């Protein structure tokens, strides 16, 4: 997408401070807590039927990891998401069947989780820049949808 110099720079800098596997776990799980119909893709994973259960469910937290890790990598191709994400887009349409509304729901719980993590370091300007990033990644996920 396009962000300024100064936009890009402020993404990159927080993210250096992020433990990708803890934040991944957290955002996954609060997805599934605050928007419980997200739960539909996940009922391999075992016991979802409380907020404590969810948050301390292993399969949750691995899956979080693995989605965040991909997002991580992504932040390093922020001139080229849609090519970055093309083949995941794919996947997630034709074999996973994930309605791309969940992408956006994850991106706004990600934002809420940065803020809780960072407190007053997650300024309004820096909010703004990750909103731009989170929207880019949704829409690049969603790009191959048919």
């Amino acid at each position: 997408v396009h962000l300024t110099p100064e936009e890009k720079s402020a993404v990159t800098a927080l993210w250096g401070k992020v433990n990708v596997d803890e934040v991944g776990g957290e955002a996954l799980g609060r997805l599934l807590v605050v928007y419980p119909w997200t739960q539909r893709f996940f009922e391999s994973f075992g016991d979802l039927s409380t907020p404590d259960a969810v948050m301390g469910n292993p399969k949750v937290k691995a899956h979080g990891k693995k989605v965040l890790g991909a997002f991580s990598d992504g932040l390093a191709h922020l001139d080229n998401l849609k090519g970055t994400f093309a083949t995941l887009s794919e996947l997630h349409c034709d074999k996973l069947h994930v309605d791309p509304e969940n992408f956006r729901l994850l991106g706004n719980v990600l934002v809420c989780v940065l803020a809780h993590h960072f407190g007053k370091e997650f300024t309004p300007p820096v909010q703004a820049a990750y909103q731009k990033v989170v929207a880019g990644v949704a829409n690049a996920l969603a790009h191959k949808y048919h």
Partner: protein, 141 residues
């Protein structure tokens, strides 16, 4: 919050549907899958080919649930409790989709009703597919 006017409008309209309500309800799905292709992510079991039994069948079921809402218009919550459970607990369709199919259904009325789709009819039908939509999504969280 449905005026008396609105009721009327809506009884009227869905009156005028009749017995094509199943046919209509197919063509709204059709319209939805072609125009808003995300919505197909909730039906990877179906064959969504033009003329699909499966869609025709589903579309009947939708229709009839709407005919039941019109019967009922003063106590929709009631009447549509099980399919509110269903969609909450079970199908777990994202609430943005509800919009999508309600516009498709408008679209299909418009196409079939050249007389009875007047402005005022349009507005009560939109408010009425909104309040259907709100009931079906009430128990999600």
């Amino acid at each position: 919050v449905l005026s008396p006017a609105d009721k009327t409008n809506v009884k009227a309209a869905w009156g005028k549907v009749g017995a094509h309500a199943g046919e209509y309800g197919a063509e709204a799905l059709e319209r939805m899958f072609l125009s808003f292709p995300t919505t197909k992510t909730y039906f990877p079991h179906f064959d969504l080919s033009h003329g699909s039994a499966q869609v025709k069948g589903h579309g009947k079921k939708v229709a009839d649930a709407l005919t039941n809402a019109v019967a009922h218009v003063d106590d929709m919550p009631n009447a549509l409790s099980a399919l509110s459970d269903l969609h909450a607990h079970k199908l777990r369709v994202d609430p943005v989709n509800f919009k999508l199919l309600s516009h498709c259904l408008l679209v299909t009325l418009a196409a079939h009703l050249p007389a009875e789709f007047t402005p005022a009819v349009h507005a009560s039908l939109d408010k009425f597919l909104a309040s259907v939509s709100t009931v079906l999504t009430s128990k999600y969280r």
